[PDB]
Design a protein around this motif. Structure first.
Motif, PDB file in Angstrom:
ATOM      1  N   UNK A  98       0.821  -1.207   0.000  1.00 18.03           N
ATOM      2  CA  UNK A  98       0.000   0.000   0.000  1.00 18.03           C
ATOM      3  C   UNK A  98       0.857   1.259   0.000  1.00 18.03           C
ATOM      4  N   UNK A  99       2.041   1.205   0.615  1.00 12.76           N
ATOM      5  CA  UNK A  99       2.908   2.377   0.643  1.00 12.76           C
ATOM      6  C   UNK A  99       3.600   2.604  -0.695  1.00 12.76           C
ATOM      7  N   UNK A 100       4.042   1.533  -1.359  1.00 18.23           N
ATOM      8  CA  UNK A 100       4.760   1.704  -2.618  1.00 18.23           C
ATOM      9  C   UNK A 100       3.816   2.196  -3.710  1.00 18.23           C
ATOM     10  N   UNK A 101       2.559   1.746  -3.687  1.00 22.69           N
ATOM     11  CA  UNK A 101       1.578   2.257  -4.637  1.00 22.69           C
ATOM     12  C   UNK A 101       1.247   3.710  -4.322  1.00 22.69           C
ATOM     13  N   UNK A 193      -7.297   0.806  -0.038  1.00 25.61           N
ATOM     14  CA  UNK A 193      -6.283   0.093  -0.807  1.00 25.61           C
ATOM     15  C   UNK A 193      -5.605  -0.975   0.042  1.00 25.61           C
ATOM     16  N   UNK A 194      -5.355  -0.674   1.319  1.00 23.84           N
ATOM     17  CA  UNK A 194      -4.721  -1.648   2.201  1.00 23.84           C
ATOM     18  C   UNK A 194      -5.626  -2.850   2.442  1.00 23.84           C
ATOM     19  N   UNK A 195      -6.925  -2.611   2.636  1.00 21.63           N
ATOM     20  CA  UNK A 195      -7.860  -3.710   2.870  1.00 21.63           C
ATOM     21  C   UNK A 195      -7.910  -4.634   1.662  1.00 21.63           C
ATOM     22  N   UNK A 196      -7.922  -4.060   0.456  1.00 26.32           N
ATOM     23  CA  UNK A 196      -7.991  -4.879  -0.748  1.00 26.32           C
ATOM     24  C   UNK A 196      -6.707  -5.674  -0.955  1.00 26.32           C
ATOM     25  N   UNK A 197      -5.551  -5.057  -0.695  1.00 27.72           N
ATOM     26  CA  UNK A 197      -4.291  -5.787  -0.796  1.00 27.72           C
ATOM     27  C   UNK A 197      -4.177  -6.850   0.290  1.00 27.72           C
ATOM     28  N   UNK A 198      -4.667  -6.552   1.497  1.00 26.24           N
ATOM     29  CA  UNK A 198      -4.742  -7.576   2.533  1.00 26.24           C
ATOM     30  C   UNK A 198      -5.677  -8.701   2.111  1.00 26.24           C
ATOM     31  N   UNK A 199      -6.792  -8.348   1.472  1.00 26.51           N
ATOM     32  CA  UNK A 199      -7.698  -9.355   0.935  1.00 26.51           C
ATOM     33  C   UNK A 199      -7.056 -10.095  -0.234  1.00 26.51           C
ATOM     34  N   UNK A 200      -6.290  -9.377  -1.059  1.00 25.21           N
ATOM     35  CA  UNK A 200      -5.658  -9.978  -2.230  1.00 25.21           C
ATOM     36  C   UNK A 200      -4.562 -10.958  -1.826  1.00 25.21           C
TER      37      UNK A 200
END
Length: 208
Positions: A98-101, A193-200
């Motif tokens: 999430x930070x790099x994006x 974005x963090x929730x979706x990446x955590x979900x991903x």
């Protein structure tokens, strides 16, 4: 003041909200589960007050810092859930991603010369669609195949929202009283974005 100073103040509060949310995340492990829903309703009331309500005076600093702490507490149910099925390091992978994006796409948008105010329609319609499937997930949990598509689409939508967000900070006239609400928007873009990446990453590293 120039925009280079206004952007530094918005990003400073944004970093503070991330730290406060991290404190709320650590404290949310001791909060009972029955308090999670009332705290969630408190956030929706704050989101309506900050963005949806016609306010003469903008939101203040204490409002945003309070939301970041409360938002961190209600983020424990989902963070601890994916740390159980995929490991504690998968949470740091999604946080780091999430930070790099945010850094890459946030910089490109802030340095982009073209005004991206015309794609406000497609971002709104995509987020409203993601909001509809979010309600469906609450009442009917999604399977692996549908949740994975929901996460990838959500990751793409909220990544383009960060690009659009900082691009509008550069082009639109940002006054001094809008600093808290602008950093509050960056926090909501970061969290979703963090929730979706955590979900991903969680579905990717499991036995679904």
């Amino acid at each position: 003041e120039s925009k280079q100073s206004i952007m530094q103040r918005i990003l400073t509060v944004f970093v503070f909200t991330l730290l406060i949310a991290t404190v709320g995340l650590f404290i949310g492990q001791f909060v009972p589960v029955a308090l999670m829903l009332p705290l969630s309703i408190l956030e929706v009331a704050m989101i309506i007050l900050a963005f949806w309500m016609r306010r003469r005076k903008a939101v203040g600093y204490a409002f945003v810092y309070t939301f970041a702490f409360v938002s961190g507490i209600t983020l424990f149910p989902i963070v601890s859930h994916y740390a159980s099925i995929a490991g504690a390091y998968v949470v740091l992978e999604a946080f780091g991603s999430t930070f790099v994006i945010f850094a890459v796409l946030g910089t490109i948008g802030a340095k982009m010369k073209k005004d991206l105010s015309f794609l406000w329609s497609f971002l709104l319609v995509a987020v409203l669609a993601l909001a509809v499937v979010g309600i469906f997930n609450i009442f009917s949990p999604l399977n692996s195949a549908a949740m994975m598509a929901y996460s990838v689409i959500g990751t793409i939508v909220f990544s383009l929202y960060i690009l659009y967000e900082l691009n509008q900070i550069k082009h639109r006239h940002i006054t001094e009283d809008l600093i808290p609400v602008m950093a509050l928007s960056l926090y909501l873009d970061f969290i979703n974005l963090f929730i979706n990446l955590l979900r991903f990453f969680g579905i990717l590293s499991s036995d679904d």
